Design a protein around this ligand. Sequence first.
Ligand SMILES: Nc1ncnc2c1ncn2[C@@H]1O[C@H](CSCC[C@H](N)C(=O)O)[C@@H](O)[C@H]1O
Ligand SMILES: Nc1ncnc2c1ncn2[C@@H]1O[C@H](CSCC[C@H](N)C(=O)O)[C@@H](O)[C@H]1O
Lengths: 202, 202
Amino acid sequence: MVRIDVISIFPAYLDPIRQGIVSVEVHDLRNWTHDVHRSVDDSPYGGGPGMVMKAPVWGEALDEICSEETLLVVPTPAGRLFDQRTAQRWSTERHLVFACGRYEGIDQRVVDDAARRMRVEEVSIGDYVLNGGEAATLVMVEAVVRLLPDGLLEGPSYTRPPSWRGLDVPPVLLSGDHAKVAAWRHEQALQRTRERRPDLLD
Amino acid sequence: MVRIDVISIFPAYLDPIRQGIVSVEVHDLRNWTHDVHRSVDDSPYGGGPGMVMKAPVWGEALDEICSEETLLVVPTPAGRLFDQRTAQRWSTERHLVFACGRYEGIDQRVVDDAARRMRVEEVSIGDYVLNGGEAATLVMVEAVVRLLPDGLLEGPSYTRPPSWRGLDVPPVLLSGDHAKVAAWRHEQALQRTRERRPDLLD
Ligand SMILES: Nc1ncnc2c1ncn2[C@@H]1O[C@H](CSCC[C@H](N)C(=O)O)[C@@H](O)[C@H]1O
Ligand SMILES: Nc1ncnc2c1ncn2[C@@H]1O[C@H](CSCC[C@H](N)C(=O)O)[C@@H](O)[C@H]1O
């Protein structure tokens, strides 16, 4: 079984995450604060464009939630790119903890302290900016959980009816020789990949 | 104002999307079915590993929801990569419709028919596989809405206290000359980018 914990100051954003193999629990980071303000952020050392999430609150939360078996994931635009191989690799883990940042991110010493006792991966889901780690956590959790018990883009798929609004299903798919269908699909996959993702051809 | 419509067979997955500039409405695709089964999928022409979403249900839904001003987004792993420039560009639109696929995706003629009357972008959020377009829609909507009224990864940030669990904030950030802080941050950004995203240096 894989146990998944998510820590966030917007726990309700993880509501879709529910939709004996996997367990999910979402925690409010403000539960490990001790001040009337329930403060989780503070001013950046060196100056900066926003606030930074405090280390003591995070360390206290991670002390309670994680153990030596934990793989701690920190969603961040400064991370390694999430990919299918990463999702497969994480699917074998027994305990994933997703630490969701907001503001400008989490004080670096949270990760440095955690790495003393567990494994930690900082991961971006793509080259675009979100407000927080929660949506990235939804994507990574879904990608992983769907893996529990070539290199061309996929081309177009069709289903019935054979004609719809003057647009016909390509005849080779209707008149089906397996070899001809595969050939047609490979050509479509290659053209699509050239058009949309030339990086995948180098 | 930007009006955002999402169409999905799992409308509840778009619940976080709520958290005079932007309007969001989620629709159940099965509302445009007419059979007792509320069927939205059918067998792939040419053979295939799964079912394909029917065109007539989608065209009927898109007839009701879209107009000539609409930019229709189809989340798909076969799409162009979503990026920050795309999110900025979409933030200027007046009407975004997100067509969420499941199973093996949507019959290609849905996109071909829609492109007769509107603009259509097929977009992937990254090189990993989800079950459906709904989580990708959460990411793209968040990236866009946060834009409404260099090229190195960001390095580490710190906030108080200056020492925590034997880990000190780097002294240059505490003893702050603006030029020295910027220099230190540029070096950290460069090393981090080399380590985690060498593709960004080519
Ligand atoms: N592409 C991405 N992948 C993973 N997490 C991301 C992400 N984009 C943003 N995040 C999450 O969002 C948090 C804040 S990033 C946004 C910072 C702030 N709004 C600003 O002025 O830019 C990060 O710490 C990370 O947890
Ligand atoms: N990286 C990505 N970016 C955008 N949409 C994606 C995506 N990965 C999956 N999707 C969405 O998920 C839908 C089904 S893809 C999964 C297909 C099926 N479960 C299988 O056997 O592989 C796509 O049509 C698209 O809407």
